[PDB]
Structure formats: C-alpha cells, structure tokens
Amino acid sequence: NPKSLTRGPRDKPTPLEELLPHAIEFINQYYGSFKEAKIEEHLARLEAVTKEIETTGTYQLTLDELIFATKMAWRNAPRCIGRIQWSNLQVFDARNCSTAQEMFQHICRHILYATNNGNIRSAITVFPQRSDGKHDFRLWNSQLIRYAGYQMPDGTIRGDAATLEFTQLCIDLGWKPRYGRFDVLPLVLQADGQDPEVFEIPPDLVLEVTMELGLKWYALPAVANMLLEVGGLEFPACPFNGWYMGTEIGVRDFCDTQDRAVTEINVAVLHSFQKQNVTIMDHHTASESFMKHMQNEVLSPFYYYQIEPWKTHIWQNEHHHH
Numbered sequence: 225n226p227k228s229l230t231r232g233p234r235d236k237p238t239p240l241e242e243l244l245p246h247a248i249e250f251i252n253q254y255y256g257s258f259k260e261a262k263i264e265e266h267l268a269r270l271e272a273v274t275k276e277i278e279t280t281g282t283y284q285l286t287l288d289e290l291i292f293a294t295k296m297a298w299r300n301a302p303r304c305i306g307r308i309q310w311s312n313l314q315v316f317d318a319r320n321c322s323t324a325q326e327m328f329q330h331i332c333r334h335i336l337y338a339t340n341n342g343n344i345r346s347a348i349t350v351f352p353q354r355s356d357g358k359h360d361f362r363l364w365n366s367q368l369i370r371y372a373g374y375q376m377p378d379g380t381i382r383g384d385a386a387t388l389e390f391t392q393l394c395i396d397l398g399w400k401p402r403y404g405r406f407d408v409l410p411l412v413l414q415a416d417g418q419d420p421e422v423f424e425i426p427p428d429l430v431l432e433v434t435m436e437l438g439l440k441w442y443a444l445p446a447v448a449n450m451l452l453e454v455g456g457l458e459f460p461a462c463p464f465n466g467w468y469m470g471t472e473i474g475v476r477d478f479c480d481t482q483d484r485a486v487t488e489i490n491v492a493v494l495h496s497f498q499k500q501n502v503t504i505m506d507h508h509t510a511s512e513s514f515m516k517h518m519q520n521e522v523l524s525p526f527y528y529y530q531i532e533p534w535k536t537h538i539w540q541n542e543h544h545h546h
C-alpha cells in the first residue's frame with residue numbers, strides 16, 4: 225500500500241470522471257473545517273465546481289480554498305518538522321502568471337518577503353495549475369537559492385555537490401560559471417511549458433550567514449521543485465520556504481575533517497545564525513512559532529516530488545547544448 229511520493233507529467237487534461245471525485249472530496253474537506261456551518265454554501269460550491277468541470281474541463285480554486293490547501297498539504301508533509309505550525313504560512317497567488325519574466329518578479333517578491341532581513345517568514349508562491357500538461361510552469365532549480373556545484377580534475381567538489389547536474393545544465397543554457405565555492409545559481413524558469421529562461425538572482429536579495437575557516441551559507445531554505453496536489457488539481461510550480469534547522473546546512477563542500485569518530489557537530493552554525501539575527505529552528509523559535517500557530521486557532525492536499533524537468537522537457541529551439 226505505500227504510495228508514490230512522485231507526481232509525473234501529463235500530455236492531456238485530467239479526465240472529468242477522475243477530476244470530479246477529487247474536487248468533491250476537497251470541497252468536503254474544505255467545508256468540513258466548518259462542521260455544521262455553511263451547509264448551503266457547501267452545496268452551492270459543489271454545484272458551481274461541477275458545472276465548471278463539465279463546461280471547461282477543469283475548475284479554479286478560490287483564494288481561500290488555495291490558502292487552505294497549501295496549509296493542509298504542509299500539514300500532510302510526513303518529514304516536515306515545521307508542519308507543527310502549519311498555520312504560519314503566507315500565500316502568494318501567482319495563478320495568473322504568464323511569462324518567465326513574471327515568474328521572476330514573483331520569486332523576487334517571495335525571496336524579499338520570506339527573508340525579511342533575517343526574520344524569516346514562511347511563504348509559498350503558487351503559479352498556474354497544470355492544464356493539459358504541455359503548458360506547465362516549473363522552476364528547474366531544487367531550491368530558489370542554492371550554490372553551484374563544480375566538477376574537478378581529480379573527481380572532487382567545488383561548491384554544492386548536490387547541484388552538479390543542475391549547475392552543468394545552467395552552463396549549457398548560457399550561464400557564465402564563476403568557479404567559486406559559494407556561487408548562487410541562477411533561476412531556471414519555465415513558463416507556459418516553454419523552454420526555460422535563465423535569470424540571475426539580484427545579489428541584494430540573497431541573505432548570507434558568515435560561518436580563514438572559510439564558510440558562508442544562505443539564510444533562506446526554499447524548496448522550488450515540488451508539485452501541490454489539491455482536489456485533482458496540480459500545481460507543478462509552487463516554491464515554498466521555511467527556515468533552517470541548523471542540523472543540516474549542507475556544507476558538503478568538503479574535506480572538512482579539519483569520543484567515538486563520527487563527531488562532526490553543527491555548533492558554529494547555530495551560533496553564527498543567531499548572532500547575525502537570522503531565524504533558525506532553535507528552542508526559542510520552535511516555542512515561539514508554535515505559540516503563534518496556537519493563537520491563530522491517499523493524502524490530499526499534498527506536496528509531491530517531480531521528475532527533474534531537464535529529463536522530460538521537449539525542447540523548442542532556444543538555448544543550445546541544452
């Protein structure tokens with residue numbers, strides 16, 4: 225019975241006999257948050273949604289349904305330690321975004337809001353939902369802000385090892401590679417299913433925490449490659465963020481060997497982030513964020529993983545050596 229955590233591509237709209245059941249269940253779940261309240265409202269919504277699916281082949285969520293879905297999907301996230309305070313989430317509605325240039329501006333706003341000069345705020349920007357699967361909006365990055373990973377002559381690493389393929393992809397799309405350890409990768413944005421466009425992230429928007437010892441690391445951990453599933457609808461583009469745990473800042477930029485044996489702690493990080501006033505999930509934050517959450521008072525909705533876009537993209541013509 226274990227279900228796939230991945231939701232792949234489509235080449236045709238979701239069939240009505242498949243969409244309706246899901247939409248109806250979401251709407252129920254939505255109105256269910258009001259036990260005996262809004263019965264006539266619930267039925268009115270069902271009738272409209274069904275009429276919408278029958279006449280247009282799909283349906284649009286309301287801003288409130290979307291907000292509710294983004295928070296439920298967060299709550300339904302198995303490994304997310306931040307899901308305890310699922311209500312502390314700012315939603316940005318970018319569902320009428322049309323171009324990669326517009327996606328770029330939305331992402332800039334997201335990064336700006338979320339970073340908040342260090343006082344990190346959790347947010348999610350929801351781009352248009354998948355229509356026929358041939359006009360998908362996708363962020364080819366794994367994270368909004370991530371360091372480039374460069375291959376060396378001896379087989380070593382310069383930068384983030386986990387971005388080897390993606391970094392290469394960037395270089396192949398024209399991006400000029402500086403060969404440092406902390407090079408912020410550009411944004412590879414796909415809009416309306418078109419070929420991806422490369423956008424440098426304004427250096428100003430990147431807040432970094434200083435760890436020679438020789439290390440830095442961005443303050444904002446924002447997942448950019450997941451898909452939000454809600455009521456049969458699919459949003460292939462919905463970057464979200466929280467704040468670091470400190471337990472993980474992947475400085476796998478290493479030869480950092482510089483008790484038993486496996487004793488490589490994560491202290492300097494906890495301290496470094498705190499003194500530079502960048503939110504990290506320490507005890508005070510865990511407690512405080514939970515307090516804020518309490519004051520506001522098949523798994524679906526859900527955030528799925530996807531097949532890396534460069535492995536599935538049917539190129540048009542743009543950017544050679546793709």
Ligand code: HEM
Binds near residue numbers: 298306346465505
């Ligand atoms: C508020 C701060 C947050 C913290 C400290 C936090 C922490 C975590 C941690 C530790 C993981 C596991 C390791 C990893 O996959 O990187 C994780 C995964 C994840 N988080 Fe968060 N998270 C936060 C906010 C969010 C937000 C705002 C969303 C979405 C709206 C979210 C959605 C997820 C999802 C979908 C995963 C993938 C793994 C899974 O859920 O099973 N997280 N988070």
